[PDB]
Design an enzyme around this catalytic site. Structure first.
Site, mmCIF file in Angstrom:
data_model
loop_
_atom_site.group_PDB
_atom_site.id
_atom_site.type_symbol
_atom_site.label_atom_id
_atom_site.label_comp_id
_atom_site.label_asym_id
_atom_site.label_seq_id
_atom_site.Cartn_x
_atom_site.Cartn_y
_atom_site.Cartn_z
ATOM 1 N N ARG A 250 44.822 30.731 43.009
ATOM 2 C CA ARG A 250 45.688 31.786 43.534
ATOM 3 C C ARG A 250 44.899 33.087 43.726
ATOM 4 N NH1 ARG A 250 47.003 30.876 38.286
ATOM 5 N NH2 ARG A 250 45.903 32.436 37.032
ATOM 6 N N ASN A 251 43.718 33.154 43.099
ATOM 7 C CA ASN A 251 42.894 34.347 43.060
ATOM 8 C C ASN A 251 41.675 34.168 43.967
ATOM 9 O OD1 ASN A 251 44.572 35.771 41.355
ATOM 10 N ND2 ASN A 251 43.453 35.269 39.488
ATOM 11 N N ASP B 296 39.778 35.538 35.127
ATOM 12 C CA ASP B 296 41.024 35.108 35.743
ATOM 13 C C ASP B 296 40.697 34.286 36.986
ATOM 14 O OD1 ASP B 296 43.838 34.883 36.204
ATOM 15 O OD2 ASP B 296 43.999 36.922 37.039
ATOM 16 N N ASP C 49 40.851 39.346 43.169
ATOM 17 C CA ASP C 49 41.637 39.770 42.014
ATOM 18 C C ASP C 49 40.759 40.068 40.792
ATOM 19 O OD1 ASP C 49 44.457 39.885 42.958
ATOM 20 O OD2 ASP C 49 44.197 37.724 43.280
#
Ligand SMILES: */C=C/C(=O)Nc1ccc(/C=C/c2nc(Nc3cc(C)[nH]n3)cc(N3CCN(C)CC3)n2)cc1
Length: 291
Positions: free
Chosen positions: A155-156, A151, A169
């Site tokens: 955003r992570n 992932d 994350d």
């Protein structure tokens, strides 16, 4: 029922003071907090930390994903480009998972805030390549610990006060061996737009799949936080990717760096660079932009 005792990581509840939410949403909630004596060499100092916990409407899966993430942080160990696990409160109350606080938030937001007009100061090219290098170092370390992240995305990634990039994350991260290969149900919770064809078509996940996502992350970086595949809905993407569609060059990006992205998006997984190869090439480019 209950969580097994891990004294090596346990932090006492009465030393933690939850503060203001940083976000809320879908999987869980993250909250600022003061933790007294969490750096054990300084037992009386309160350090600002970030605590991940469950919300009221949490599900069994939500809980097992939080447990999972905490477990994964312990296994992978420590690196300057990976968010630091500081401790957990696992006993006699809600699961709290305590991380270092990155003041500047996720990379996506940090990058958009620094777009040229029409904390606020326009990013230089050297800054974008640095950011890229840091993240390639983190991922190189990850692969070497037999961990796939699954992932990777702007955003992570979190950004500290000194503008250090930290991969965060680890909800979906797995030991390379702990993937249920070829099963229909595998890789069903990865954001489609960052995910390698073979993760959906074949239901596998290797380090070469993380390299694909890194390509998307690079495009995110050089567009200062653009949305992958502008205006192509998730539902049409895979037929396009099968046909050879790839994103065009961002403007703030050299031909060389774009060729690296396109390499990360080779159809054939074994034909994509390794994280180790990416690190070397990014070093060369950064050392030369600095001089
Ligand atoms: C599904 C939607 C959803 O829940 N989205 C969402 C999740 C989590 C957050 C929290 C963002 C965040 N995090 C930090 N710092 C941090 C987190 C961790 C583990 N360690 N450090 C900081 C910030 N901000 C600081 C800067 N501010 C200007 C913005 C927020 N945000 C948000 C949304």
């Amino acid at each position: 029922y209950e969580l097994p005792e891990d004294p090596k990581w346990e932090f006492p509840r009465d030393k933690l003071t939850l503060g203001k939410p940083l976000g809320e949403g879908c999987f869980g909630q993250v909250v600022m907090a003061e933790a007294v004596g969490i750096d054990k060499d300084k037992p009386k100092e309160a350090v600002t930390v970030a605590v991940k916990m469950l919300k009221d409407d949490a599900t069994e899966k939500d809980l097992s994903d939080l447990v999972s993430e905490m477990e994964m942080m312990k296994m992978i160990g420590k690196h300057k480009n990976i968010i630091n696990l500081l401790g957990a409160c696992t006993q006699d109350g809600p699961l709290y998972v305590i991380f270092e606080y990155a003041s500047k938030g996720n990379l996506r937001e940090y990058l958009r805030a620094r777009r040229p007009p029409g904390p606020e100061e326009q990013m230089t090219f050297k800054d974008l390549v640095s950011c890229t290098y840091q993240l390639a170092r983190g991922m190189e370390y990850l692969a070497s610990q037999k961990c796939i992240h699954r992932d990777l995305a702007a955003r992570n990634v979190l950004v500290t006060e000194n503008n250090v990039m930290k991969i965060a994350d680890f909800g979906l991260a797995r030991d390379i061996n702990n993937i249920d290969y070829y099963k229909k149900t595998t890789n069903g919770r990865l954001p489609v737009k960052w995910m390698a064809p073979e993760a959906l078509f074949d239901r596998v996940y290797t380090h070469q799949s993380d390299v694909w996502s890194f390509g998307v992350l690079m495009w995110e970086i050089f567009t200062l936080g653009g949305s992958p595949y502008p205006g192509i809905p998730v539902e049409e993407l895979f037929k396009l990717l099968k046909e050879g569609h790839r994103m065009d060059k961002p403007a703030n990006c050299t031909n060389e760096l774009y060729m690296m992205m396109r390499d990360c998006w080779h159809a054939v997984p074994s034909q994509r660079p390794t994280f180790k190869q990416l690190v070397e090439d990014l070093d060369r480019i950064l050392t030369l932009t600095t001089n």
